[PDB]
Design a protein around this ligand. Structure first.
Ligand SMILES: O=c1[nH]nc(-c2ccccc2)[nH]1
Length: 270
């Protein structure tokens, strides 16, 4: 209504129900919009985000609609703090979900999680939109066990330099190809590399990549041409897919369309 653009939600339409924990921009809550519609509400900590830039980008992000992408419903702007309102994912972060041994996952379920992510990424690739921080920590799981990709592109608005400098203590070294670590060359193919690492995280039930190495050691290992190796739960064909994402030459890495085809082949065969 009157004082609101299409990207803007009236915070007075929110009912807060449960705390969901803290992320990098601060508190996240579960609530309802207009009494009925489940939402997640991110309260953006003052000084954590380039807010005017993020708000302009929210206009673009709201047009990205795919069933395996966590939907952005809008932003509560011109208040402190601002809120980001998104599709609620009742089973929480993928990384924590994988680490819960009670689930006793079959490998068919693990491949389905990879396929869910791959479908989201093929869609983003088709829109020339890079995620820029693909990892299990940035995927969520709904009440049906479907995995969706979250927070796509948001790293561009993070003001904490520890996160944004390749040398910063919070940079995602372990999800980065050599050309990112060496010269900050981001591309579709750096998303591809990250996706390979994410498949490794899924098949490793949420182990940290390069778990025995520091970030500095990881960067040296990768830059010298060495890689992660096969998780016990990955078949040879699954391992071949994740490994293909790690070619030293970025142009020899597959596209998300090719990865999706390869994943569906393995689903049929295995
Ligand atoms: O953007 C979203 N949607 N849903 C969540 C969520 C986060 C933590 C725990 C449970 C759900 N975050």
């Amino acid at each position: 209504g009157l004082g609101y653009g299409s990207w803007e939600i009236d915070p007075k339409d929110l009912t807060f129900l449960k705390e969901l924990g803290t992320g990098q921009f601060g508190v996240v809550k579960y609530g309802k919009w207009r009494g009925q519609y489940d939402v997640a509400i991110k309260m953006i900590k003052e000084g954590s985000m380039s807010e005017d830039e993020f708000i302009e980008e929210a206009k673009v992000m709201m047009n990205l609609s795919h069933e395996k992408l966590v939907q952005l419903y809008g932003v509560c702007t011109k208040q402190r703090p601002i809120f980001i309102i998104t599709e609620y994912m009742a089973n929480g972060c993928l990384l924590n979900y994988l680490r819960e041994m009670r689930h006793r996952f079959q490998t068919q379920q693990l491949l389905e999680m990879c396929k869910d992510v791959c479908e989201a990424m093929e869609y983003l690739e088709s829109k020339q939109f890079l995620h820029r921080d693909l990892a299990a920590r940035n995927c969520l799981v709904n009440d049906q066990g479907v995995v969706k990709v979250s927070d796509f592109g948001l790293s561009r608005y993070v003001l904490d330099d520890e996160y944004t400098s390749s040398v910063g203590s919070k940079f995602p070294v372990r999800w980065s190809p050599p050309e990112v670590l060496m010269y900050s060359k981001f591309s579709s193919k750096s998303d591809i590399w990250a996706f390979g690492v994410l498949m490794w995280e899924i098949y490793s039930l949420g182990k940290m990549p390069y778990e025995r190495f520091t970030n500095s050691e990881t960067a040296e290992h990768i830059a010298q041409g060495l890689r992660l190796y096969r998780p016990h739960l990955a078949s040879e064909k699954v391992y071949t897919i994740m490994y293909s994402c790690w070619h030293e030459k970025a142009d020899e890495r597959p596209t998300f369309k090719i990865l999706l085809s390869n994943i569906l082949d393995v689903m049929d065969e295995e």
